[PDB]
């Protein structure tokens, strides 16, 4: 019985930044959700609209896997009805989200002495991001009265900000990898079910 390749998502060598969050579509397979529960890496496993036990007994036409990296104290923003810089400007979940949120500490892989600057998050935007939208524009954002023409000044900010992950940083500030599973059920054969 062919299984859903969850390993290609969780054990990916490189994880995309939060602003440019990577989405993989998983379809037409069977997935055993109990390799997830019975693991100790995952510090955060929370579900909305469904119950972990039910997952084995249900079927879904398509499962989406959104993956990215954020700060520890920012994981609380990956939930419906939350606010903050990440939830407002980078990744927003709809109010009726039905799925599970999985996160684990990745300090051994994404930090380096002196700081790892390759991970960025969006810090400025004209309006709040609509749910499941990924704008990756990098134009200069004008925050003050002075008009901006592409030269960063006191009132002309580059919209992206590096995290600067360090190993010395406390657990609250260490990098966490996040994977969001979304369960949509369309009008189509549901070939994602439980293995029983």
């Amino acid at each position: 019985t062919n299984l859903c390749p969850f390993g290609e998502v969780f054990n990916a060598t490189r994880f995309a930044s939060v602003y440019a969050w990577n989405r993989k579509r998983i379809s037409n397979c069977v997935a055993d959700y109990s390799v997830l529960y019975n693991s100790a890496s995952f510090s955060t496993f929370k579900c909305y609209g469904v119950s972990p036990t039910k997952l084995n007994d249900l079927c879904f036409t398509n499962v989406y896997a959104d993956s990215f990296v954020i700060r520890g104290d920012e994981v609380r923003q990956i939930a419906p009805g939350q606010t903050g810089k990440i939830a407002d400007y980078n990744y927003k979940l709809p109010d009726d989200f039905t799925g599970c949120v999985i996160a684990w500490n990745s300090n051994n892989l994404d930090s380096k002495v002196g700081g790892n600057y390759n991970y960025l998050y969006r810090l400025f935007r004209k309006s709040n991001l609509k749910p499941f939208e990924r704008d990756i524009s990098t134009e200069i954002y004008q925050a003050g009265s002075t008009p901006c023409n592409g030269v960063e000044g006191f009132n002309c900010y580059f919209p992206l900000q590096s995290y600067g992950f360090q190993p010395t940083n406390g657990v609250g500030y260490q990098p966490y990898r996040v994977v969001v599973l979304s369960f949509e059920l369309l009008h189509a054969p549901a070939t994602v079910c439980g293995p029983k």
Partner: nanobody, 129 residues
Framework: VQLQESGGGLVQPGGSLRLSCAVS????????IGWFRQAPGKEREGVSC????????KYADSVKGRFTASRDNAKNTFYLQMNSLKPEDTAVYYC???????????????????????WGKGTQVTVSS
């Protein structure tokens, strides 16, 4: 990491001052140091922002031409020289640090208010006669 503020004083109009900010425990290869101010009755406002190297200095329009930001060559201490002070400049001044942004082979050193990671305790500066 610890941030200490010093040099707060009372001076006559037109006088000068020098604020110091001691930077300790930062192992980051590239960071930025910003000076902010908070006046009575108003929100916090940016005044200055400098690179760790000290090559790039950015000043707000109000303070431009009167404030000079420099870094010592033998210590990790950053200075904000304030000349020709005006009474409206009275406020509590805060030292703050933030990581620099690396993108596509170019570094940016900015001081966005909401992005600062560490703050100092601040000192009051009053300019009266």
């Amino acid at each position: 990491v610890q941030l200490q503020e010093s040099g707060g004083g009372l001076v006559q109009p037109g006088g000068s001052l020098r604020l110091s900010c001691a930077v300790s425990g930062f192992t980051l290869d590239y960071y930025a140091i910003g000076w902010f101010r908070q006046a009575p009755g108003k929100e916090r406002e940016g005044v200055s922002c400098i690179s760790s190297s000290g090559g790039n200095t950015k000043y707000a329009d109000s303070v431009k031409g009167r404030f000079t930001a420099s870094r010592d060559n033998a210590k990790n201490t950053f200075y904000l020289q304030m000349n020709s002070l005006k009474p409206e400049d009275t406020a509590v001044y805060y030292c703050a640090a933030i990581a620099a942004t690396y993108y596509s082979g170019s570094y940016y050193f900015q001081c966005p208010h909401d992005g600062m990671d560490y703050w100092g305790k601040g000192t009051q500066v009053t300019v009266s006669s």
